[PDB]
Amino acid sequence: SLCKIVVRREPLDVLLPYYDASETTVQKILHENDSTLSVKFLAGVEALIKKDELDKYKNGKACLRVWLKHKSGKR
Amino acid sequence: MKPPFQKKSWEDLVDCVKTVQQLDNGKLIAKIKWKNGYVSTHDNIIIHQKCPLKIIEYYEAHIKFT
Amino acid sequence: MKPPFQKKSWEDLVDCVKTVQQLDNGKLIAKIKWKNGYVSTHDNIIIHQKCPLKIIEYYEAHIKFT
């Protein structure tokens, strides 16, 4: 008996006018945790983010790109 | 009024999560109602860090078993 | 190997929530896989206290927009 969370779709402009798009600007990668990276966001929150989901956040793709170059020794 | 990021927890200041929706890039965002009447919308990762028990309450209010 | 019920957080010890199910009486229970490969079952109320981010991860993996 599978479990699911069933949410009625709403137009995004019910939500977005009250959304500060700057909050989750990625500022830096702080450390690793298994496959994830601990990141500092501009709003002043730290969180574990999956590497393949960093591109969902402002500056996440760019930050990951540089981190990968340092991690691999190309920088 | 700006969300108070200087506070480690928002559990006591938030009334409820009103809805969670999905952006085109697949990220989830959540609209929250504060106890003081204000509303704000955040990436879900923010809500996970500031008031996870409110979003758990919201998800469990929408749970369905097959 | 018993769960560390005295420890305030289990986030670092748990791999994932595998399932949430509802017992006849209505209670929700969560089956969790620990990072050591063991599995145990707990009232959701306990999981909210111990590893809320893990149950959030599970719920967000099973959101369906209608």
Residue numbers in the entry:
A (entry chain C): 7 to 81
B (entry chain A), C (entry chain B): 315 to 380
Question: What did the paper state?
Answer:
Through their multivalency they act as adaptors between histone H3 Lys9 di/trimethyl marks in chromatin and effector complexes that bind to the HP1 chromoshadow domain. In fission yeast, the two HP1 proteins Chp2 and Swi6 assume distinct roles and Chp2 is tightly associated with the nucleosome remodeling and deacetylation complex SHREC. Here we show that Chp2 binds the N terminus of Mit1, and that an extensive interface between Chp2 and Mit1 provides a high-affinity interaction that is required for recruitment of Mit1 to heterochromatin and silencing of gene expression.
Limited proteolysis of a complex consisting of the Chp2CSD and the N-terminal 300 residues of Mit1 revealed a protected Mit1 fragment corresponding to residues 1–81, which we will refer to as the Chp2 interaction interface (CII). This Mit1 fragment formed a stable complex with Chp2, which readily crystallized and allowed us to determine the structure by molecular replacement at a resolution of 1.6 Å. Mit1CII occupies the canonical peptide-binding groove at the CSD dimerization interface and, intriguingly, it wraps around one of the Chp2CSDs and engages an extensive interaction interface. The structure allows for the unambiguous identification of residues 9–13 of Mit1 in the CSD dimerization grove. These residues correspond to the sequence CKIVV with I11 occupying the center position on the symmetry axis of the CSD dimer. The Chp2–Mit1 structure reveals an extensive interface that buries 3354 Å2 of surface area involving the CkIvV motif, linker region and CDL domain (CkIvV motif: 1465 Å2, Linker: 1131 Å2, CDL: 750 Å2).
